[PDB]
């Protein structure tokens, strides 16, 4: 029969990705694939096989076009006439990490597997992090030529 | 040391001294049968050339004949009155590899 | 109205080759 994962064969790892002058779409795609563990050859849909990730310097995220004022993030509390809106510029000005957190959340399955997965991500705004005691491995986005 | 064997239009990974479930092939129990080859793995060397694969041969011993699990089939459509019944079982053969 | 225009316009998807039941 095909190989299946046992009780304690799974192993995790620590990764860190910089966000200095990078495109949000590429960053989100890389983060999602790393979270899901598609790279690892021990993929199985039913059990998570993801790997830890660290994102630094969120405020330097670069977005093309006029999206600084023509893209809007909506949400509604629930009472009648409570639909209020915010713009990406103000969102970055106030909460730098909210945009990236929301993007990654939307970039993953919405079932409870993904609900548990999103615990796997930590996102920061400054260039530092108190998680230096676990020796994260730097990572870089690359393309496989074909 | 393990190789790959073709049988019944399909393949199974098998090593020395193992037993696998294979679809029934005409052979008296207790005799030996020769099988073609697909791929051979030996240590750090891998044999992939068609001529070498064809030259190599596989030998195995047939142990017994066995039947698979029973399965029940029903056809059904809504608001038609169509009800259909059908049973079925498959025949299998169990063999033991001898040498490769 | 808006309802009517949608279904007829949505028929112009290349998947269905432009011909669909009920316009």
């Amino acid at each position: 029969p095909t190989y299946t994962p046992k009780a304690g064969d799974t192993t995790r790892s620590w990764y860190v990705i910089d966000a200095s002058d990078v495109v949000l779409g590429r960053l989100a795609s890389a983060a999602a694939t790393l979270l899901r563990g598609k790279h690892k050859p021990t993929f199985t849909p039913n059990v998570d096989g993801g790997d830890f990730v660290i994102v630094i310097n969120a405020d330097k995220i670069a977005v093309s076009g006029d999206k600084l004022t023509k893209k809007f993030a909506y949400r509604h509390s629930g009472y009648p006439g409570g639909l209020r809106k915010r713009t990406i510029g103000e969102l970055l000005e106030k909460h730098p990490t909210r945009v990236v957190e929301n993007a990654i959340i939307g970039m993953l399955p919405h079932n409870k597997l993904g609900r548990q997965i999103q615990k796997k991500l930590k996102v920061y705004a400054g260039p530092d992090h108190p998680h230096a005691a676990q020796q994260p491995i730097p990572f870089e986005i690359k393309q496989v030529a074909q | 040391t393990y190789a790959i064997v073709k049988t019944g239009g399909k393949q199974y990974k098998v090593a020395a001294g193992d037993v696998v479930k294979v679809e029934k092939l005409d052979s008296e129990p207790g005799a030996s049968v020769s099988l073609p080859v697909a791929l051979v793995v030996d240590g750090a060397n891998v044999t992939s050339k068609a001529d070498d694969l064809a030259k190599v041969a596989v030998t195995a011993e047939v142990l017994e004949h066995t039947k698979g699990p029973k399965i029940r089939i029903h056809k059904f459509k809504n608001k038609t009155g169509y009800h259909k019944r059908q049973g079925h079982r498959q025949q299998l053969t169990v063999l033991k590899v001898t040498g490769i | 109205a808006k309802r009517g225009r949608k279904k007829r316009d949505r028929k112009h998807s290349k998947a269905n080759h432009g011909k669909r039941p009920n316009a």
Partner: protein
């Protein structure tokens, strides 16, 4: 699983299958998957064989 293994080994799945077809090796996707989870050295050897068997230019009009 095969796509993940090939991407880890730095070659695309489509090119890997093309190389296998060119070399004329008829082993099946299940065999490749099991071998990859079991024998990374064998998987690397097969990948190298496929890369060697690949044509010169994939963009040629041939």
């Amino acid at each position: 699983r095969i796509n993940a293994a090939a991407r880890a080994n730095d070659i695309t799945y489509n090119r890997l299958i093309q190389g296998l077809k060119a070399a004329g090796v008829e082993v099946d996707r299940k065999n490749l998957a099991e071998l990859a989870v079991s024998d990374p050295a064998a998987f690397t050897a097969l990948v190298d064989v496929a890369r060697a068997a690949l044509p010169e230019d994939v963009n040629a009009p041939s």
